[PDB]
A = this chain, B = another copy of it.
Amino acid sequence: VQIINKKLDLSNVQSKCGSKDNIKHVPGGGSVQIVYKPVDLSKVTSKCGSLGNI
């Protein structure tokens, strides 16, 4: 009943950001979820001289 994963990871990231989730994973009936007036206004600048493998 063998399971064999053998994973190899060489990945690279310059800047990595997690989630910014407002309401998340709320199991139950008759519950109330309100998200009111969100504003994403954020800025991302990425500049690179050469991107990719080989």
- Chain A interface residues (CB < 8 Å from chain B): 1-54
Beyond the given A14-B15, A15-B16, A36-B37, could you list 19 further A-B residue pairs with CB under 8 A, ordered by the A residue number?
Answer: A6-B6, A7-B7, A8-B9, A15-B17, A17-B17, A17-B42, A23-B35, A26-B27, A28-B30, A28-B31, A32-B34, A38-B38, A40-B41, A41-B41, A42-B42, A42-B44, A49-B49, A52-B52, A53-B54
Given contacts A5-B6, A27-B27, A30-B28, contact A22 B35 (CB under 8 A): yes
Select one of B29, B41, B54 contacting A31, CB under 8 A: B29
Collect the chain B residues with CB atoms within 8 Å of residue A53's CB.
10, 12, 52-54
